[PDB]
Design a protein around this ligand. Structure first.
Ligand SMILES: *[C@@H]1O[C@H](CO)[C@@H](O)[C@H](O)[C@H]1NC(C)=O
Ligand SMILES: *[C@@H]1O[C@H](CO)[C@@H](O)[C@H](O)[C@H]1NC(C)=O
Ligand SMILES: *[C@@H]1O[C@H](CO)[C@@H](O)[C@H](O)[C@H]1NC(C)=O
Ligand SMILES: *[C@@H]1O[C@H](CO)[C@@H](O)[C@H](O)[C@H]1NC(C)=O
Ligand SMILES: *[C@@H]1O[C@H](CO)[C@@H](O)[C@H](O)[C@H]1NC(C)=O
Ligand SMILES: *[C@@H]1O[C@H](CO)[C@@H](O)[C@H](O)[C@H]1NC(C)=O
Ligand SMILES: *[C@@H]1O[C@H](CO)[C@@H](O)[C@H](O)[C@H]1NC(C)=O
Ligand SMILES: *[C@@H]1O[C@H](CO)[C@@H](O)[C@H](O)[C@H]1NC(C)=O
Ligand SMILES: *[C@@H]1O[C@H](CO)[C@@H](O)[C@H](O)[C@H]1NC(C)=O
Ligand SMILES: *[C@@H]1O[C@H](CO)[C@@H](O)[C@H](O)[C@H]1NC(C)=O
Ligand SMILES: *[C@@H]1O[C@H](CO)[C@@H](O)[C@H](O)[C@H]1NC(C)=O
Lengths: 488, 488, 488
């Protein structure tokens, strides 16, 4: 008769890392890092994004002639833009607080264009101005959302216009100021010099004076156009007054839907799929708490770490080898993790200890859940733009993001490295504890063999082996025969 | 005769969380999170705060006629300001670099008001101007710390004034520029058009031009007043020159005491209590690392986390059931953690080991003290204000704060879980070591019963048990009759 | 004859820290913190730094008459500046976006000075202006890289000048505007009132108007000079136009070499040594992962923490005491860590177990390397400069730096403590495992003595002892002899 205690082994080739040892083969493992994407851009939560194409944000809002598709834009989930868009400000110039506007458009999901100042209301000016830079079919043209006021005959009266925000939400209004090349242009266009442009609301007041100078030619013109924007609150009035050089707005953008969005810089094209997490390289369909695809994610997504391998051990060490756990594992005990092997006269087979296996299984599952179900990630549509005179702010942002990434990478790496040690020691501690429990139950009626096995002095049938496995071993009832056989 | 090794059990209820199991009942536990406050705004370190009431900082520093109780204010610990104050600027307008001023006030604890430009020195202008927007008892009035200069007769000379800072500390000076509504109001107030206001110091030069335009009416007026501020250094001079539209100062604010203060946005009122850690919801009185009351605190305030429960286990696992440490804990052993139970003919009672319990106590205490005392933080204010043209900066600050708090939350949770697991394993290891030491010392004169209890072969008296409990047991002394009784 | 199991002890007095114990003596330990520097400023990677002296960045770039040794500056690795430079703008004034220029200079390692507008091209103006503040040898002078334009006779024609960037890289250009003290000197210098200065590129437009006002006298003069800078891209043109008050540039700075550099604020001089990291207090020649000299460094440098000591335990617990291991360590085992001691008829002596010692050594080395070789050492927390109106941004930078530095200090301390505890427990477990291995192999043939020492029941000679040492012990061979001696 003989009973042995050992652990389960199989043909797995999975490896882990530990703070003491490297490349340790295990029976089971769980990868908690995602490294695969579909390489495609598609709909987030069922709502397609806003594809700008070769246009820019300023070109879309101002109404570039070469962006006529984006004049009635439906709802969107995120905005796709190119790094160096071609269709941009048609007339050379600038755009004040451009980055602030782009940041505002990261929490806006829909716009509704209202006509606030109709073109025909300017009955004392000429409103059919154009330029060769912004040309369609050879003929000169201009922005579709702005009006260029010019003299009607040799006189340019004071231009006055107002609008009361009775739409139902905040409104985005853009106006421009013209900077000619020479005094001859100013006289030919506005008939007077020393002009001003004045825009004022209940919070904003602004005066601008045209500045005439010879400039390097961009797009073939030495003139420039400067654009500014404001955010009009509900039930508030905006006032325009100018003696010249005013590029008035004809449409106002009302914020219809708010939420979480962002601008994602790609060179790609929308395709047909759905997703819940989006990266500039592709979508992610995963449930693990880590990934290393791309830092700039849009939507609820797993955390980003700069790691190539994060594997958690959920099984025993694979040391293949009748002996017991001192020699190695068993490749025939496919019922659990810790078990026995009886060798009596009426049979020779393996088994599993249900209680210890269940306890260890619950512990490992709880550990995996605790490591996984402890990280809280919000929407976090990161990504901000800074101008060429804001380099310190850009460096600050970059340093903050990199610092947090390094902190989290170190945290995750060391956590996995320590917990793999803990589980690998937990398993052999459990095996030794089971061996000690069996030895304490058996007392001196058996004979330790040194390889993890026990040799019985009394002939033990299958029922007595079952009693030993359960825990109801009756030492006194086999005591006398054991003594007689041992003393002999 | 028997001797057993076991541990202590009681009727405790406190639960802890480990990394392998959840809701483990323990004998002793320590809470390292505080969630209670008195809901009252108190005096920090015995100095009452500054109750602005319905006034803004601009109203206090400019002399709003209805904020007349703040003309002379004593020392303060922090400033309490409502979220939307209602007496800020009776005359509509703007304050330049307002948030910078509010940040500067976070390091100032006392102001002394010094008359720098007396109102009677302007002997060539009119200094009694007023408006209905700032009205007292119905009659028109104006700010109490500023002077409005107006034509005396049908002429307006150049207004010149200077002050040399011979006070003893840095000075704060506020001036303003008036922007009228129409040309008639400019002519009826300053008699000339095309005026300027020039303010200059050794490190500052600034010239402003009045703006005349029709604007929407706020408080019944279409005109605006724009205010600016500067910090005058010691032994430095400030010059004022204006041909119109100047709202000159009369008082300057000198920084008397410097320190660490802050602005708290609350709607409450000050009560009679003393406090070292103040939050917008109440006061904290605790000696613990973490809390979960409010992020924006002021004072020597404990660390902040987003967790609801952080309990450290400083005791044994509570499992009740004469058996030993295998079958569970003991409810009769009251004077220690580990111990022995013995049963002679001359007595049957409990005991407790001293060296082992003392070592365990010292280790647990050192662990708790290390976790508590490594977290070193100081007193600083975390509130910052940003304007509506600075939203990227606001998002940067918000993201940095949130990220740091999530990092510390993760650190605290992992620390507590892993340390609880290690402590609960440490207790079992200590008990097993005690059992092993006793067994090694007793050698073969005894017989293991398998439930942690040892049964002697020879008769053992009280002195023998006292000898086996401390580490001096004479195996040769009882060897011979132990053999005689065993072999029988 | 007996065989015993014990561990190594020696005369080291090194101490390490543990999460459960303080000041624990260990046989071997490794220090991973560097606290020493050579107290010198010298060459970084073979390139000497730029010694400004009493110069300033603006004084060097403008051509201060006393800042005359840096008119032809070779390659540099970092810039050494003083906290309060004395040779600075000799004509009083300001410098717009100074901190942005200083930030840009942190990524440029070489400049080349190109004559873009020769001083002889101004044939219709006077170009020999000077001031007593900006003085050499008593007689008046001016900056050496700028031209002051003044009327030639009683006439100031329209100044005009352009440059096309055909150099090869980006160019930095600085110009200035003069702000006089009174109308008399404006007329005596520029012959007209109501002047302007226009500078324009393909991406920059600017118009400035002089400000005439009496000002406090700094450096003896009541007038000021305001300077501005731009970054001209390749194949781009800059246009200058002025009717007065223009300080035109004569040279432009080409960015010859780019890289990683910085500005270090010290008060010392350059000496003759060669380093790889540089701190304001000295230089570091180390390979350790950490240091605590100064937060601001330049070069490949270890991480900075607020720690007084960080020592990793790589040895056993020094417990000086043949007994074995229950009583203490051995001072005679000079070979390895764990070993045996035999005492038979032939002789006595110590030995060492090669397998256990090698396994433990490899594990400890792997742990040390994992702690050290997991910290991202790319660069450090650079030093940024902010103005007096950017206090909020400076506070943000300071708080982020402090938060990250605190987080890393806490992480390193807790890592060291927990690793030390686990190392000591690891050594204890290894010794116990060796003891249990020998006991299981030897079984009943021996009797245990209770202090780590086994006594045989037969004659175990040198062949026997070498057999037991390397795990090949024939229990059947001596079974009958052991039974004979045991039973009797
Ligand atoms: C490992 O054994 C399993 C049997 O459970 C088998 O399905 C699998 O294919 C084997 N793996 C390899 C690589 O042969
Ligand atoms: C572990 O395996 C990797 C291959 O994935 C190898 O580069 C590395 O050297 C191995 N380490 C050890 C200790 O065998
Ligand atoms: C704008 O309209 C609202 C209601 O539609 C009205 O209360 C408000 O007075 C109007 N604004 C002005 C300046 O009249
Ligand atoms: C632990 O106990 C708390 C009691 O507040 C309960 O809410 C929670 O669900 C319990 N968790 C488990 C895993 O039993
Ligand atoms: C201001 O007063 C100080 C004396 O406290 C004097 O030294 C200084 O010259 C004065 N400033 C001016 C501009 O006269
Ligand atoms: C604060 O707690 C201490 C206990 O340390 C107590 O003595 C004191 O009365 C408490 N004060 C208040 C205001 O609760
Ligand atoms: C410790 O012992 C070593 C022998 O290897 C010796 O070289 C060293 O000087 C000793 N140190 C002290 C402090 O005794
Ligand atoms: C450890 O040693 C240091 C210096 O020798 C001493 O200040 C400290 O009190 C000691 N701590 C303990 C627990 O002995
Ligand atoms: C500047 O020079 C480049 C080539 O040297 C030329 O292509 C460009 O047209 C020039 N710029 C102007 C404004 O002529
Ligand atoms: C610097 O450290 C190196 C170790 O790589 C050493 O060889 C060299 O002598 C050291 N130089 C000085 C000046 O300390
Ligand atoms: C073990 O040592 C004995 C010496 O008694 C030697 O004969 C045998 O070859 C050794 N075996 C191994 C595996 O080193």
């Amino acid at each position: 008769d003989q009973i042995c205690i050992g652990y389960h082994a199989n043909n797995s080739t999975e490896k882990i890392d530990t703070i003491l040892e490297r490349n340790v083969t295990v029976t089971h493992a769980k990868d908690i890092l995602e490294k695969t994407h579909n390489g495609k851009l598609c709909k987030l939560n069922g709502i397609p994004p806003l594809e700008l194409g070769d246009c820019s944000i300023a070109g879309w809002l101002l109404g570039n002639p070469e962006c006529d598709r984006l004049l009635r834009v439906p709802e969107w989930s995120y905005i796709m833009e190119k790094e160096n868009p071609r269709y941009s400000l048609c007339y050379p110039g600038s755009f004040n607080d451009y980055e602030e506007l782009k940041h505002l458009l990261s929490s806006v999901k829909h716009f509704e264009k209202v006509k606030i100042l109709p073109k025909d209301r300017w009955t004392q000016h000429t409103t059919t101005g154009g330029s060769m830079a912004c040309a369609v079919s050879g003929k000169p043209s201009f922005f579709r959302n702005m009006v260029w006021l010019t003299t009607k005959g040799p006189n340019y009266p004071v231009a006055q216009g107002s609008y009361n925000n009775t739409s139902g939400e905040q409104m985005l209004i853009i106006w421009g100021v013209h900077h000619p090349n020479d005094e001859a242009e100013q006289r030919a266009l506005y008939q007077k010099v020393g002009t001003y442009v004045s825009a004022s609301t209940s919070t904003l007041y602004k005066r601008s004076i045209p500045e005439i100078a010879a400039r390097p030619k961009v797009n073939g013109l030495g003139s420039r156009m400067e654009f500014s924007w404001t955010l009009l609150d509900m039930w508030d009035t905006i006032n325009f007054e100018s003696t010249g050089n005013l590029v008035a707005p004809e449409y106002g953008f009302k914020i219809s839907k708010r939420g979480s969005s962002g601008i994602m810089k790609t060179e790609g094209t929308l395709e047909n799929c759905e997703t819940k997490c989006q990266t500039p390289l592709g979508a992610i369909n995963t449930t693990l708490p880590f990934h290393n695809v791309h830092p700039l994610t849009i939507g609820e997504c797993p955390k980003y770490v700069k790691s190539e391998k994060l594997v958690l051990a959920t099984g025993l060490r694979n040391v293949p080898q009748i002996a017991g756990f001192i020699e190695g594992g068993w490749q025939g005990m496919v019922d659990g993790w810790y078990g026995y092997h009886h060798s009596n006269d009426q049979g020779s087979g393996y088994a599993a200890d249900k209680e210890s296996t269940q306890k260890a299984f619950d512990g490992i599952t709880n550990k995996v859940n605790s490591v996984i179900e402890k990280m809280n990630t919000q929407f976090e549509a990161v990504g901000k733009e800074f101008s060429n005179l804001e380099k310190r702010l850009e460096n600050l942002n970059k340093k903050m993001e990199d610092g947090f990434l390094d902190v989290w990478t170190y945290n995750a790496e060391l956590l996995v490295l320590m917990e793999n040690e803990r589980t690998l020691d937990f398993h052999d501690s459990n095996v030794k504890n089971l061996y000690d429990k069996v030895r304490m139950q058996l007392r001196d009626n058996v004979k330790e063999l040194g390889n993890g096995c026990f040799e019985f002095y009394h002939k033990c049938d299958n029922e007595c082996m079952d009693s030993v496995k359960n825990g109801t071993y009756d030492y006194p009832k086999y005591e006398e025969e054991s003594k007689l056989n041992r003393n002999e």
